[PDB]
Amino acid sequence: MDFTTLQNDFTNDYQKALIANNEFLEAKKYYNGNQLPQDVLNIILERGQTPIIENMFKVIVNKILGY
Amino acid sequence: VEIEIKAIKPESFVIDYFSTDKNALDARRFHKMLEVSEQEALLLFGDSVIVNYSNVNHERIASVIES
Numbered sequence: 001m002d003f004t005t006l007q008n009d010f011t012n013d014y015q016k017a018l019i020a021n022n023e024f025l026e027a028k029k030y031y032n033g034n035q036l037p038q039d040v041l042n043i044i045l046e047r048g049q050t051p052i053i054e055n056m057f058k059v060i061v062n063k064i065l066g067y
Numbered sequence: 068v069e070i071e072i073k074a075i076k077p078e079s080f081v082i083d084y085f086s087t088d089k090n091a092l093d094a095r096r097f098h099k100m101l102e103v104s105e106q107e108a109l110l111l112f113g114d115s116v117i118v119n120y121s122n123v124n125h126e127r128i129a130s131v132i133e134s
Contacts, residue, residue, distance in 0.1 A: 012124045 031058055075099060098134045105129070 029035075035053050036044075044051040081098035082091055091097075103111065105127045108118055120127040 008125050012126070 031061065096134055098132055101131050101133060103129045103131045 033053060033055055035055065036051055041051055079100045081100070083094040083096045086092075086094040105120065108120075108129050108131070118129055120129050
C-alpha cells in the first residue's frame with residue numbers, strides 16, 4: 001500500500017520469474033530468425049562461410065496458428 | 068451452496084500406508100502438505116492461536132499439514 005512493500009514484492013516477483021522470461025525472450029528470438037549463438041556465428045564467419053539458418057519451426061507455429 | 072472441485076498435486080498428498088488396494092477405500096488417514104500465505108492463514112483461523120511462519124524471502128509463508 002506504500003512504496004516499501006510494493007518495491008519488495010516486485011523484486012521478489014521479478015527475480016523468481018526471470019528464468020522463465022529469459023526463456024520466453026529466447027523463444028521469441030528463435031521464432032524471428034535469431035537461432036545461432038554468438039560463438040557459433042563467429043566460428044562460421046571466421047572460415048568465410050555464410051551462416052544458413054533453417055527456420056524449420058516457424059512454419060510449424062505458423063501452421064498451428066493458421067488452424 | 069456450491070460444490071467446488073479441485074485436483075490435488077499428488078506429490079503433496081500422503082495416503083495411509085496400510086491401504087493396499089486401488090481407490091484407497093480402506094484408508095484411515097489422508098495428509099496433504101500445503102503452502103499457505105500469511106493472510107490466507109489469518110482467514111483460515113483467527114489470531115488467537117500461534118502460527119509458526121517461515122521467512123523465505125519477505126512474506127511469512129507457513130507450511131501446514133491438513134490431515
